[PDB]
Design a protein around this ligand. Structure first.
Ligand code: HEM
Ligand code: HEM
Lengths: 437, 437
């Protein structure tokens, strides 16, 4: 019946402890020894992994039909609500998604670039003329500054920014597990407590700005005044959930992804020089404070670098669904209720799709390359289909801004070898030595 | 087909969040609205709860046959080994259990009483003439002193005791859960690290005492020299696992259970006086330092109090198995691979078995009571059958010693109301005000 089973499973535990220790290597061993469809054994549960563009297309296409999203993160419901976004019924999901999409399509990035540039320059200021910085701990707070400043406004970021960021780390803990009596980790209580406080703080700011509006409107003003397509008003609670969702969905992902991207550049000086020349051609000298959206969109080699870092180090190293019904696929049956996985980390390094898959070669995405590797559903570090990452343009633009400003200001080198760890981040410490240019 | 489903389940999550918040109240609601057999819904998994003496007897009798122990705590395997104790094949389990049973049958408690009394008197010394103490944080370290002193010896407890107790808190974290990419909590790494250090420290002590034996032998000396019944030697690794198992199995359980027992006594002064008179009749005045095993076994009213605290507040509030095959039971089918639970917390308060079940009435266990409630498999806070708690006599004797010595030395009162939370402990702070007698 089932997907071909990966061998080497331990008694009782199966592969789960191996996965615990190094998930991508477990996933790669499935590709190398079993192929594009294989089962892992997680404590007696079959985990059905599919690889490559055809299976990726199927996974995205069948989400909300044969494949269920909610069981990938059931306690999203408690962080947010059972009627919110991808957890809501189809009609309601689409209505709420219609609030988000116009604010995050590629055209809409004009809005956000000045805040991205300003906070990047604040980072340059904090770093000074020379020193060393740890990647994730340094860039994480900047990603968060950009999120809060962009989606809540400058004033909120100055006045309430400190209290807001502390509640978020607790809020983000709300995906906790349990101990043998089904006794819970503290973290779920702290997450609930932070959620209630985040909601009161956000509601106060909604009321503040509706009493005292900012015209012309920023993101926040437009958000709290938006209605659904049919004309009905968007409930305040939905607004609050949406904003928290954006900050949550974009925080640890972007901080890790951009850290991988800088690391890739610092390990490939020839291409970093390609990037420095593109930035210099567009911006001239100086600290990069003149970086505009119009400059940004012209940065074609930066775009290639960001695609290549996504390919080599997708922080979304695995994606997850549960089957709503039995699925027969190429002779194997996924049973109803079993997990179904994509693995961007492994799919992205299939020689069948990406020749020389361990090489850093951004020009493989250049459409003028006859050898180009741009088939649809082959680069899936942002998902796909209806449930593609809503922030994919915001994330790529923010990485571009952070890297441009850092490249323009600093000579940099990696101090440590990079190491691993859904979530795939450089192992701390991953430090950069720098000296201002 | 299934066990009657408890109503009130939330979308997707079922009852799991309700259970998270207050498990005994979920379990009680199953008894009150569905009866002795009911299903809970944990994120789409049926949890089959059975209640009362007949079902308890079945659960214990069928463990290792229709019911599997390992899936109740799969990562016991990593804390210990897949070939250790209840995780080993039947023959090997029984061989290793044959090392433990002679050291913990009721007759064998003579060995341990002097260490229990000494450490209890050390507690009296630390408390001084008056003050306040928090139950779990104060008595937890004493339970651990008694374990290390009893099973490793006085010298180990003095020299290596501090380092040993710090590694154990990390070791005990090794029952961790995960986050949405199956990304693990730190705690499993700390647990593994502590396990390796605990094993090296224990092996050094095995080698020390085999070079320099303690004659007459203490527990440790006899343990490292024991052979299996057939004459074959017990591997050092098994010895180390066994000792760690005893300390682990007895630490948080006994500290919580004895705290409940003191709380019950401080809430029922008339019976505490019954206890004080029994202690005075046996020991006279003084600090209780003359408490001997021969005195201890005569303390029939203390025995009743400990049974009644076990009934009202079993720290093992729930017990867990997975079905090895479909089990038909009174018209309902447990499917293979589903969880099967006992709930001592609820079973112990069934009016059908224990009339006036919320009353503290230790005399209900007195065999001279015509109304006595002593049917087999009705008091199950220590499990039952082949897999009954191996330490049940050691735990009861230690609680008796700790309470005797405290009652003999201090007038005490509860400062706070008691509150809840496998594991069921008084909610901290649960404080006792005391003044020496
Ligand atoms: C480099 C950074 C990021 C990566 C790698 C990333 C990746 C992803 C992936 C893989 C998905 C699809 C999940 C699945 O299929 O199970 C997703 C969903 C989502 N992401 Fe991102 N993300 C990033 C940044 C952001 C940012 C900055 C935002 C918001 C501004 C955001 C908003 C969302 C939302 C709202 C969804 C849900 C889409 C839906 O179900 O309709 N993410 N993200
Ligand atoms: C008041 C304290 C304690 C309580 C409430 C308690 C309770 C239990 C329960 C309910 C079980 C059976 C688990 C199941 O059926 O799933 C058990 C097993 C066990 N306990 Fe205790 N325990 C306590 C103290 C101790 C102490 C002090 C030791 C050791 C000195 C100990 C050693 C063990 C061992 C070795 C097992 C495994 C039995 C087997 O599977 O053969 N426990 N305990």
């Amino acid at each position: 019946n089932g997907f071909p089973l990966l061998d080497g499973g331990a008694p009782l535990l199966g592969h789960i402890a191996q996965f615990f220790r190094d998930p991508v290597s477990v996933l790669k061993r499935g590709y190398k020894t079993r192929g594009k469809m294989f089962a892992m054994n997680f404590m007696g549960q079959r985990m059905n992994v599919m690889l490559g563009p055809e299976h990726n297309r199927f996974f995205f296409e069948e989400t909300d039909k044969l494949l269920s999203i909610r069981e990938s993160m059931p306690f999203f419901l408690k962080m947010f609500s059972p009627d919110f976004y991808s957890f809501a019924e189809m009609d309601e999901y689409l209505r709420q998604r219609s609030i988000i999409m116009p604010r995050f399509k590629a055209a809409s990035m004009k809005q956000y670039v000045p805040v991205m540039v300003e906070e990047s320059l604040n980072l340059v200021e904090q770093l000074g003329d020379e020193g060393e910085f740890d990647l994730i701990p340094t860039l994480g707070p900047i990603v968060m500054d950009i999120a809060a400043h962009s989606f809540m406004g400058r004033e909120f970021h100055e006045k309430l920014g400190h209290e807001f960021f502390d509640l978020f780390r607790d809020f983000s803990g709300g995906m906790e597990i349990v101990l043998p009596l089904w006794l819970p980790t503290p973290k779920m209580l702290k997450s609930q407590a932070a959620k209630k406080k985040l909601h009161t703080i956000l509601q106060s700011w909604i009321e503040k700005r509706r009493a005292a509006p900012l015209d012309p409107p920023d993101f926040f003003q437009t958000m709290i005044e938006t209605k659904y397509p049919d004309g009905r008003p968007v409930p305040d609670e939905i607004i609050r959930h949406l904003i928290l969702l954006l900050v949550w969905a974009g925080h640890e992902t972007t901080a890790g992804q951009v850290s991988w991207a800088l690391a890739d550049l610092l390990q490939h000086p020839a291409y970093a020089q390609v990037l420095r020349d593109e930035i210099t051609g567009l911006l001239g000298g100086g600290d990069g404070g003149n970086l505009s959206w119009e400059h940004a969109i012209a940065m074609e080699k930066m775009d290639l670098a960001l695609r290549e870092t996504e390919r080599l180090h997708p922080v979304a190293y695995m994606l997850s669904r549960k089957a709503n019904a039995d699925i027969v696929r190429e002779g194997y049956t996924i049973r109803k209720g079993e997990f179904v996985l994509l693995a961007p980390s492994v799919s992205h390094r299939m020689e069948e799709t990406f020749p020389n898959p361990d090489a850093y070669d951004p020009e493989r995405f250049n459409p003028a390359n006859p050898n180009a590797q741009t088939t649809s559903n082959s680069l899936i570090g942002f998902g796909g289909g209806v449930h593609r990452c809503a922030g994919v343009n915001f994330a790529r633009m923010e990485m571009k801004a952070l890297l441009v400003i850092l490249l323009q200001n600093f000579d940099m080198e990696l101090m440590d070898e990079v190491k691993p760890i859904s979530t795939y981040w450089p192992a701390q410490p991953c430090r950069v030595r720098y000296k201002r240019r």
